[PDB]
Write a protein that binds this ligand. Structure first.
Ligand SMILES: Nc1nc2c(ncn2[C@@H]2O[C@H](COP(=O)(O)OP(=O)(O)O)[C@@H](O)[C@H]2O)c(=O)[nH]1
Length: 262
């Protein structure tokens, strides 16, 4: 209908429980084209102008699994206006790995910090506002068990969209990697969508074959990117894939130190 919201998080983060509260009996079950992966969507019960596109639970957008491919293709397309990232608050650091990839898509992320009621019993506290600040995304505490925060997070995701968010606030990595990403961006120009340019730049840096075949870049474009990779790999003395994963982990680690307590 009007605003299209992508619902995604790790498996066992409470996505289904949240999807059900939000949509009630306005659901639609189907098929992602060509594959047997279930496509589920629904209208927001309290606001039929908002549709929710549920996406398969994944730990990462990287793998060449059907589930991750579905998520990648949907989120690199133009259908979604907002990403509503369901996060398991009792397992924050591992959940944020996908989150970082989600922000890089350029579709504005809103986090539903789910399982907020489980924290206390585990002797765990989170500073929602501090977590929100360091990720550059809105964060709203939710619980599908106690049915709290649900309307609040939906409303926030609905007002944090591609049409209302001006500048992309991606996670900032080591200068040396940013220099490489920045240089790949220079080379790319119009060859990639402006919103998801950085996502494409990181993928080409990681030497993603699917993206490489998709983009069909020129001789000169492909050559410069090769030289950027080799020189940066040399600078770090690691392969590209490992540089990126280690930058994500360092960033996420910082963030969890700032926001988590015992
Ligand atoms: N205590 C508590 N349990 C939850 C919450 N959200 C979901 N669950 C439970 O977590 C389990 C997994 O929920 P689910 O919606 O299937 O997560 P999903 O695998 O991402 O779809 C179920 O037993 C839910 O009842 C929550 O906020 N608090």
């Amino acid at each position: 209908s009007m605003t299209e919201i992508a619902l995604i998080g790790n498996p066992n983060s409470g996505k289904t429980s949240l999807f059900n509260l939000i949509t009630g009996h306005n659901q639609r079950v189907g098929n992602w084209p060509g594959v047997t992966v279930e496509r589920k969507s629904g209208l927001v019960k309290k606001n039929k102008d908002l549709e929710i596109q549920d996406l398969p639970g994944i730990y990462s957008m990287s793998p060449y699994s059907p589930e991750a491919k579905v998520a990648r293709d949907y989120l690199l397309s133009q259908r979604a206006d907002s990403i509503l990232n369901v996060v398991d608050a009792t397992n924050l650091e591992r959940n944020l790995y996908l989150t970082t990839q989600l922000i890089e898509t350029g579709i504005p992320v809103t986090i539903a910090l789910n399982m907020i009621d489980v924290l206390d019993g585990q002797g765990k506290k989170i500073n929602v506002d501090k977590l929100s600040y360091h990720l550059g995304v809105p964060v709203v505490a939710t619980s599908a068990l106690k049915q709290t925060g649900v309307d609040q997070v939906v409303k926030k995701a609905a007002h944090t969209t591609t049409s209302t968010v001006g500048d992309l606030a991606f996670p900032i990595y080591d200068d040396r990697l940013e220099a490489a990403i920045s240089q790949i961006l220079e080379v790319l120009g119009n060859s990639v969508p402006q919103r998801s340019a950085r996502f494409y730049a990181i993928k080409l840096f990681e030497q993603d074959s699917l993206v490489e075949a998709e983009l069909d870049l020129s001789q000169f474009q492909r050559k410069e990117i090769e030289d950027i990779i080799r020189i940066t790999e040399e600078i770090f003395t690691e392969d590209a894939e490992s540089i990126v994963i280690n930058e994500r982990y360092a960033f996420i680690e910082r963030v969890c130190q700032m926001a988590e307590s015992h």
